[PDB]
RNA sequence: GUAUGUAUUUAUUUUUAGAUACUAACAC
RNA sequence: GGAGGUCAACAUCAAGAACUGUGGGCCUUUGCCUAUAGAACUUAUAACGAACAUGGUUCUUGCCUUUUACCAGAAC
């Protein structure tokens, strides 16, 4: 079917972006894989 | 006044109406002025109601 | 120059008189048109505003006839009458165009209003419409031009 | 056919008739914006409809016909349209026929060219939702038909019958005795649609009985969505007929399916 | 950008039988129907004078995610109801692949910023004892008709009609308990 | 001469004297 | 084809006292030197406007409980 696309132009008057609108909004964190976290007391106690 | 000048922007010759009458949904027309007073005092009135 | 009859408008050339009862009918209509007869649906508003736009057509063609056609009137009266706003200056000249003698408004044949493309549905001619509606046979629909009540402006109906 | 086919649909009211906006004193003052009432809360407000259609007699012939439009005309289902045969929406009770027009676009949209939402509403309120094809209304308030008290169930259920009788094509219905509910099953979800849009707000009994004159001081019954049903049997039912008509779509996938290769 | 980019998802049915179509694209249209965000819009028209017009209900994310159309929202190879294509599926194993859905709010406007794809879209006078669309289809070309009456609980009831009734009962009482009611 | 907060469901979803007292936009 | 329009779009309007094109020579296109043609509008008690408003930041003050609203000078 092919298509055209075409923008309208917005009445000057009304808002433009008819649905923007401030919300708040939890956003999931996607964690694909894992990052392996990497490194290489008895009488430090008393000292600390 | 004349000690500090503003030296007008360029690139300003865009203006409100000239963008405004573009579209569909501005017309234009003439009219008596008073009735134009008029018109605008109950376009106010409007607005802030 | 304005309607109003404000003391540096100059007074009515000779053969206003005879012309003067058909154009009243007209202006006590217009009154009549806009005294905000309230409606609640849409297109009952849009109605209304039709009733205006065909009135104004109705006067500027009357005059048109009279010069134009007849030349029943002189020309001094003619251009007092556009400068005393009874007519409609461009739409009259739009009417002198070839295509256009039965035109509408100044609105029909904006391009750069209408979205795509251009000039009212209201501006072709029944003849198509009826052979575009036969290739579907689902008739036609079109009615009236949203800005007027234009039912065919084309000069062929 | 030689009903509704020929004869051109009816102006039900005349345009001056249609009643006001601005519904009355709610409250102290009026309100532009929104359109309501200010401050105080009066007793809550709800009325029974002036208004109402007859199917047969109002029924007909209108523009969008010849147009080719799928969406009937709400104002006609309430009977209050005041358009006649210039109106833009169908005027008569929906067929088979229309629905098969519509069987595309009914999945997010009612009949009338409304758009779903998707949780259906606290109450079950006034448009279903597109997730779940619910063809049953709840009656309620059926003291739509005032403080007439009646012989047996058998006059609510016979009246019911012979209201939404009308309205369209009905699988089953169920009035309840214990809790004043009847239950109302259609084929189509289109004529659910139209139905709860048409009874919504009406009156009972007969053109002219008792107190009928005074019927328009009533509350007027609520026409909602109706919940599912807790009871073993239907739920059987459900189940099954989700489980044949399941079957017969996959006769479609494989033959569609088999073409596709 | 992120909202653009994506292309549309629209099935090849409710997008009609024309050539080339012209769609209209508002950056910024209504919150999806589903997630409750706002996305960018697209009407269009079947035909070019058809009055009626389609608007694409839900996002491009939550689409996708059920793997549908946007105008139609069924399934985007099958045509079927998201909450049928679950079923044919789950026919196959045995208890599955039901498409959880998000109630509260951000719940569900949460929900759809994930990128999981979704369970179902991984794969893709007379008295008469012992419905009523039934009985009155099929009294309904042998004759008149008038009214029928049925209560599901007593299992029986009455149809009534306007000699044609006595046409309806060569075929009607065993096929049935039809009699003449009082 | 207290912000502020909580609740406001009506319309029927299938099986004998007084002391020690507390406090009071009430009287310098 | 001429006159216009309270029509539009696109260019350009603060700088070595200042623009552009072209011919020729050197370096190796830029750039320098030489030759030639045309330069609308705006500028010397300096500028598109013979007119004259507001805002932001930063300092200095002034009112002076504090913030908006402000006092009156400067620079950007
Ligand atoms: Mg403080
Ligand atoms: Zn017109
Ligand atoms: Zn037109
Ligand atoms: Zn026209
Ligand atoms: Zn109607
Ligand atoms: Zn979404
Ligand atoms: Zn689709």
Same mark, same amino acid.
């Given at each position: ?48 | ?49 | ?31 009549? *048109? ?9 297109? +009952? ?37 556009? +400068? ?18 039965? %035109? ?6 904006? +391009?750069?209003?209408?979205?795509? $493309? ?10 198509? %419409?009826?052979?575009?509606?036969? +290739? ?15 039912? $065919?402006? *084309?000069?062929?109906? | =056919? ?77 009977? =209050? ?6 109106? @833009? ?25 409304? &758009? ?40 609510? &259920? ?18 309840? @005795? ?12 289109? !004529? ?24 328009? @001081? ?8 109706? !919940? ?20 017969? =779509?996959?006769?479609?996938?494989? !033959? ?6 | ?164 009734? #006595?046409?309806?009962?060569?075929? #009607? ?10």
């Amino acid at each position: 079917h092919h298509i055209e696309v075409v923008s309208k132009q917005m009445d000057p008057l009304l808002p433009r972006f008819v649905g923007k609108k401030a919300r708040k909004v939890v956003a999931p964190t996607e964690n694909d894989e894992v990052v392996p976290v990497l490194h290489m007391g008895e009488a430090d106690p008393n000292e600390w | 006044n004349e000690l500090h000048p503003t030296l007008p922007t360029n690139h300003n010759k865009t203006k409100l109406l000239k963008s405004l009458k573009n579209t569909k949904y501005f017309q234009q027309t003439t009219i008596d002025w008073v009735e134009a007073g008029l018109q605008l005092c109950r376009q106010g009135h409007n607005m802030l109601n | 120059m304005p309607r109003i009859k404000t003391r540096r408008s100059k007074p009515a050339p000779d053969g206003f008189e005879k012309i003067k009862p058909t154009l009243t009918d007209f202006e006590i209509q217009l009154r009549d *048109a806009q005294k905000d007869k309230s409606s609640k649906l849409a297109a +009952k508003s849009n109605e209304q505003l039709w009733e205006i736009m065909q009135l104004h057509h109705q006067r500027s063609r009357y005059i048109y006839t009279l010069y134009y056609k007849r030349k029943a009137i002189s020309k001094d009266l003619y251009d007092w009458l556009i +400068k005393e706003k009874y007519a409609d200056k461009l739409l009259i000249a739009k009417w002198r165009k070839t295509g256009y003698e039965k %035109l509408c408004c100044l609105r029909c044949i904006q +391009k750069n209003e209408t979205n795509n $493309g251009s000039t009212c549905i209201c501006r072709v001619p029944r003849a198509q %419409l009826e052979e575009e509606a036969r +290739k579907k046979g689902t008739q036609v629909s079109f009615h009236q031009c949203v800005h007027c009540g234009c039912r $065919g402006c *084309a000069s062929t109906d | =056919m030689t009903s509704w086919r020929d004869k051109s649909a009816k102006v039900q009211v005349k345009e001056s008739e249609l009643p006001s906006s601005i519904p009355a004193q709610t409250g102290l003052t009026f309100n532009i914006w929104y359109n309501k009432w200010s401050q105080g809360f009066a007793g809550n407000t709800r009325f029974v409809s002036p208004f109402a259609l007859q199917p047969q007699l109002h029924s007909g012939k209108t523009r969008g016909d010849n147009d080719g439009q799928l969406f009937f005309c709400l104002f006609f289902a309430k009977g =209050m349209c005041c358009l006649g045969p210039k109106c @833009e929406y169908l005027h008569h009770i929906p067929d088979e026929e229309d629905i098969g027009k519509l069987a595309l676009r009914t999945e997010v949209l009612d009949c009338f060219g409304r &758009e779903k939402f998707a949780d259906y509403r606290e109450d079950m309120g006034g448009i279903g939702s597109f997730r779940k094809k619910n063809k049953t209304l709840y009656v309620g308030g059926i003291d739509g038909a005032l403080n007439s008290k009646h012989l047996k169930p058998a006059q609510i &259920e016979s009246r019911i019958r012979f209201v939404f009788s009308r309205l369209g094509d009905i699988d089953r219905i169920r009035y309840v @005795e214990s809790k004043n509910c009847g239950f109302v099953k259609f084929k189509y979800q289109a !004529n659910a649609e139209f139905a709860k849009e048409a009874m919504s707000n009406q009156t009972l009994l007969l053109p002219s009985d008792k107190e009928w004159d005074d019927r328009r @001081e009533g509350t007027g019954l609520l026409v909602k969505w109706a !919940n599912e049903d807790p009871d073993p049997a239907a739920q059987k039912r459900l189940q099954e007929e989700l489980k044949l008509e399941s079957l017969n =779509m996959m006769v479609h996938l494989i !033959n569609n399916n088999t073409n596709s290769a | 950008d992120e909202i653009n980019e994506p292309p549309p998802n629209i099935c090849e049915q409710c997008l009609g039988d024309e050539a080339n179509i012209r769609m209209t694209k508002i950056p910024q249209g209504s919150e999806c129907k589903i997630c409750t965000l706002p996305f960018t819009l697209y009407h269009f028209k079947t035909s070019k004078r058809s009055n009626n017009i389609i608007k694409t209900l839900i996002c491009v994310r939550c689409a996708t995610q059920r793997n549908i159309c946007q105008c139609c929202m069924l399934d985007s190879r099958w045509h079927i109801p998201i909450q049928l294509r679950d079923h044919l599926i789950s026919l196959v194993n045995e208890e599955n692949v039901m498409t959880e859905e998000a109630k509260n709010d951000m719940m569900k406007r949460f929900l759809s910023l994930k990128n999981v794809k979704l369970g179902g879209a991984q794969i893709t006078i007379d008295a008469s004892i012992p419905s009523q669309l039934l009985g009155i289809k099929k009294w309904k070309d042998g004759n008149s008709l008038s009214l029928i009456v049925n209560h599901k609980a007593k299992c029986g009831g009455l149809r009534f009609q306007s000699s044609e009734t #006595l046409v309806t009962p060569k075929g #009607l009482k065993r096929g049935l308990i039809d009699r003449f009611r009082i």
